[PDB]
Design an enzyme around this catalytic site. Structure first.
Site, PDB file in Angstrom:
ATOM      1  N   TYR A  97      36.561  33.539  24.083  1.00  0.00           N
ATOM      2  CA  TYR A  97      35.279  32.879  23.860  1.00  0.00           C
ATOM      3  C   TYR A  97      35.450  31.550  23.133  1.00  0.00           C
ATOM      4  CZ  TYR A  97      30.224  32.561  23.452  1.00  0.00           C
ATOM      5  OH  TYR A  97      28.909  32.175  23.580  1.00  0.00           O
TER       6      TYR A  97
ATOM      7  N   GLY B 275      38.168  29.729  22.818  1.00  0.00           N
ATOM      8  CA  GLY B 275      39.057  28.811  23.505  1.00  0.00           C
ATOM      9  C   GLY B 275      38.732  28.488  24.951  1.00  0.00           C
TER      10      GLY B 275
ATOM     11  N   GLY C 221      35.369  27.898  26.192  1.00  0.00           N
ATOM     12  CA  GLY C 221      33.992  27.450  26.301  1.00  0.00           C
ATOM     13  C   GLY C 221      32.999  28.587  26.451  1.00  0.00           C
TER      14      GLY C 221
ATOM     15  N   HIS D 162      28.342  32.415  16.326  1.00  0.00           N
ATOM     16  CA  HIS D 162      28.103  31.006  16.034  1.00  0.00           C
ATOM     17  C   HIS D 162      27.323  30.342  17.163  1.00  0.00           C
ATOM     18  CE1 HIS D 162      29.516  26.662  16.096  1.00  0.00           C
ATOM     19  NE2 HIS D 162      28.874  26.752  14.945  1.00  0.00           N
ATOM     20  N   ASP D 163      27.736  30.624  18.393  1.00  0.00           N
ATOM     21  CA  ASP D 163      27.111  30.036  19.570  1.00  0.00           C
ATOM     22  C   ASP D 163      25.699  30.576  19.763  1.00  0.00           C
ATOM     23  OD1 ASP D 163      26.790  28.549  21.917  1.00  0.00           O
ATOM     24  OD2 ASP D 163      28.850  28.960  22.560  1.00  0.00           O
TER      25      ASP D 163
ATOM     26  N   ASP E 134      27.080  26.901  11.166  1.00  0.00           N
ATOM     27  CA  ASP E 134      28.465  26.500  10.943  1.00  0.00           C
ATOM     28  C   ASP E 134      29.074  27.215   9.736  1.00  0.00           C
ATOM     29  OD1 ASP E 134      28.121  24.788  13.094  1.00  0.00           O
ATOM     30  OD2 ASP E 134      27.634  23.060  11.830  1.00  0.00           O
TER      31      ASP E 134
END
Lengths: 122, 122
Positions: free
Chosen positions: B27, B29, B31, B47-48, B89
């Site tokens: 995930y 690495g 995209g 995070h996404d 973040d």
């Protein structure tokens, strides 16, 4: 490896490898195609070709050592593989340093789409 | 922005975001094309998803400030975007740190065909 290259990027550009140079243009990213955008983007192109010349080695994984003299990377420690990989990373990083002016922040996360046209022979 | 997030990753994991996390797993690495194979790989997923709950913010580009109290990140005031992005973040970097015991260096540049596509819904 890519670790020493990252540290080199931070030492030469004073900007972190991510996101400044790992998601840039059409080549400064994990696998690139199309023609390169600006001068900075082309540095990664030359970096890839440089890596590509070292089929006898494992540029991404093989760790190496490097030191500085008058503020310039020497990278002359171990195997010729490591030496040449270090040389590639040095060239790329310095190329980043010499193109801070041309560097466009808009080219960060430049999509793989609209990156036309695949590709360009080394 | 991803700049602040990068500096957060460096500060919390004591490692440069690239290549340690930019290229990690399926995930982080790739995209977000594949299922997370790790806890720290899942950190990128969460995070996404955090970025997903935010609109119309520009998490990648919009800058923000952050202080540091007793080992703790303090997001700065301003636009609600600038605060919530910073919270995403922060949560992500802290997540990276808390799972450093699980972090596998061998998951850097993980094979694509070994990744399970696609990931889950957030």
């Amino acid at each position: 490896s890519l670790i020493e290259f990252a540290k080199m990027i931070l030492e030469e550009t004073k900007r972190l490898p991510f996101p400044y140079y790992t998601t840039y243009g059409c080549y400064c990213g994990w696998g690139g195609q199309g023609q390169p955008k600006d001068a900075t983007d082309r540095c990664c192109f030359v970096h890839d070709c440089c890596y590509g010349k070292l089929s006898n080695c494992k540029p991404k994984t093989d760790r190496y050592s490097y030191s500085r003299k008058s503020g310039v990377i020497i990278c002359g420690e171990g195997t010729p593989c490591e030496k040449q990989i270090c040389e590639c990373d040095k060239a790329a990083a310095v190329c980043f340093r010499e193109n801070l002016r041309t560097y466009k922040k808009r080219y960060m996360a430049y999509p793989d789409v609209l990156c036309k046209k695949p590709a360009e022979k080394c």
